[PDB]
């Protein structure tokens, strides 16, 4: 079908368009405030569904929605209309009152012409293509912090009610096919978050500093997860990468990749053609060795024993070798090319309280 998006050059617009063009077969007609009146009528008349995302001469009727509905008046089919209103319609301030006037206008128009309408009262939004140093405080904070530019926070206790652009787009796609999410008898976007400005700033700064301490976001917390992804989007195009700390010597190198306080950490060990590393055991520290290039052996020997157990392994067949506690173990490069072993460990490395003890074989 034909979908027209008013305010298509906006934050939600660019996102909805990108998704719809890739995820669907529908013909998408974009409408922005620089779309000659000629095509505006064109697209509107062709329309099967209208996603009205656009905004709201010091005198005179300048309502854009009014104009749009006016033109749709000559549309054979009764295309459904989606109206993005605000939770501000409640409050009594110019912005809220304006958005309220828009709903009212649309319901009246609907009762006369019969178009099915989906009116949502969205809260503040956040997500990737929002513009910084404009209206969105989150986009501004992400953009600045990712550039070590200082930010200004008047009150960290200020609460924010939000919806992530991903939900917004998923809900619109659901309305587009007549299955909107209803709650309290009205269409309403799911997963609304209530967060403090302070919590946001902390999270953002943590995201930036996580680059250095190889830290990760708590991914089972929806808001944090969504915030992390949007933060990444405001990254300078020349700052997508960062150098890791390689510990180098004659045997090769050992590099930490990812560290977490609850699921261990993973590092990369590189061993030169003939060296052997290890020959030690642990009380409770334990690992998972995975060689992704080269070939060699991982040897074990229970502390109270003489039998040596060997595990020949290489990058051709990917297999993990657990390192059970209480066994000294070592790993050796048996090939002529560097051996690279990915190592997962159940805890952070601490030279003061190490849990590793030297013991050959």
Q: How far is the CB of 246 from its own copies (least distance, A)?
A: 5
| CB 49, CB 79: distance < 8 Å | yes
- Annotated catalytic residue 205: no
If the CB atoms of residues 67 and 302 are measured against its own copies, the closer one turns out to be 302
Kindly give, in sequence order, each residue whose CB lies less than 8 Å from that of residue 257, ignoring residues fewer than 6 positions away. Answer: 214, 244, 265, 266, 267, 268
Show the tokens assigned to 352.
């003061």
If the CB atoms of residues 109 and 289 are measured against its own copies, the closer one turns out to be 289
Q: How far is the CB of 141 from its own copies (least distance, A)?
A: 16
Show the tokens assigned to 84.
């993005």
Q: How far is the CB of 99 from its own copies (least distance, A)?
A: 27
Backbone φ and ψ of 123, nearest 5° = -95, -165
If the CB atoms of residues 124 and 293 are measured against its own copies, the closer one turns out to be 293
Please report the sign of the dihedral spanned by the C-alpha atoms of residue 197, residue 202, residue 208, residue 210.
negative
Can you tell me the distance from the alpha carbon of 200 to that of 197, in angstroms, rounded to the nearest whole number? 5
Q: How far is the CB of 32 from its own copies (least distance, A)?
A: 13
Q: How far is the CB of 273 from its own copies (least distance, A)?
A: 14
If the CB atoms of residues 93 and 237 are measured against its own copies, the closer one turns out to be 237
Q: How far is the CB of 209 from its own copies (least distance, A)?
A: 14
- Give the burial string for 152-174 (b: 16+ CB within 10 Å, else e): eeeeeeeebebbbbbbbbebbbb
Can you tell me the distance from the alpha carbon of 311 to that of 74, in angstroms, rounded to the nearest whole number? 77
Can you tell me the distance from the alpha carbon of 95 to that of 224, in angstroms, rounded to the nearest whole number? 29
If the CB atoms of residues 64 and 327 are measured against its own copies, the closer one turns out to be 327
Can you tell me the distance from the alpha carbon of 113 to that of 158, in angstroms, rounded to the nearest whole number? 43
Show the tokens assigned to 101.
């006037």
| CB 78, CB 110: distance < 8 Å | no
Strand order in the sheet with 27-31: 27-31, 2-6, 49-52, 80-86, 117-122
If the CB atoms of residues 88 and 328 are measured against its own copies, the closer one turns out to be 328
Identified catalytic residue from 64, 95, 120, 143: 95
Q: How far is the CB of 238 from its own copies (least distance, A)?
A: 8
Q: Report CA 87 to chain centroid distance, whole Å.
A: 25
Strand order in the sheet with 265-271: 246-248, 252-259, 265-271, 339-345, 287-293
Position of tokens 């995820």? 23
Known catalytic residues are 95
């Amino acid at each position: 079908m034909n979908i027209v998006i008013t305010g298509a050059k906006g934050f939600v617009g660019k996102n909805l368009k990108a998704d719809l063009t890739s995820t669907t077969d529908h013909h998408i007609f974009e409408v922005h405030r620089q779309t000659k009146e000629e095509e505006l009528e064109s697209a509107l008349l062709k329309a099967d569904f209208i996603v009205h995302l656009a905004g709201v001469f010091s005198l005179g009727n300048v309502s854009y929605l009014d104009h749009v509905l006016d033109i749709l008046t000559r549309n054979t089919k009764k295309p459904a209309i989606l109206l993005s209103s605000s939770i501000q319609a409640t409050q009594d301030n110019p912005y809220g009152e304006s958005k309220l006037q828009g709903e009212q206008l649309l319901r009246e128009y609907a009762e006369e012409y019969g178009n099915t309408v989906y009116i949502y009262r969205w809260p503040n939004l956040f997500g990737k293509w929002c513009k910084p140093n404009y209206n969105s405080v989150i986009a501004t904070f992400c953009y600045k912090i990712a550039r070590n530019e200082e930010i200004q926070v008047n009150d960290r206790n200020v609460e924010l009610t939000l919806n992530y652009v991903d939900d917004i787009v998923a809900e619109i796609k659901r309305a587009i096919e007549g299955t909107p999410t209803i709650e309290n008898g009205v269409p309403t976007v799911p997963n609304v978050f209530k967060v403090t400005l302070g919590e946001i700033v902390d999270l953002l700064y943590k995201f930036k500093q996580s680059r250095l301490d190889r830290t990760l976001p708590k991914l089972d917390n929806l808001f944090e997860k969504d915030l992390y992804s949007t933060y990444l989007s405001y990254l300078p195009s020349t700052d997508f990468s960062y150098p890791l700390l390689m510990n180098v010597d004659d045997r090769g190198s050992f590099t930490e990749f990812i560290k977490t306080p609850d699921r261990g950490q993973v590092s990369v060990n590189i061993s030169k053609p003939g060296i052997t590393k290890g020959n030690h055991w642990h009380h409770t520290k334990n690992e998972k060795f995975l060689v992704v290039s080269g070939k060699g052996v991982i040897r074990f020997r229970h502390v109270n024993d003489d039998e040596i157990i060997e595990y020949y392994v290489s990058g051709d067949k990917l297999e993990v070798v657990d390192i059970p506690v209480g066994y000294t173990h070592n790993i050796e490069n048996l090939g002529d090319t560097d051996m690279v072993t990915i190592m997962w460990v159940n805890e952070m490395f601490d030279p003061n309280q190490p849990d590793t003890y030297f013991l050959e074989v």
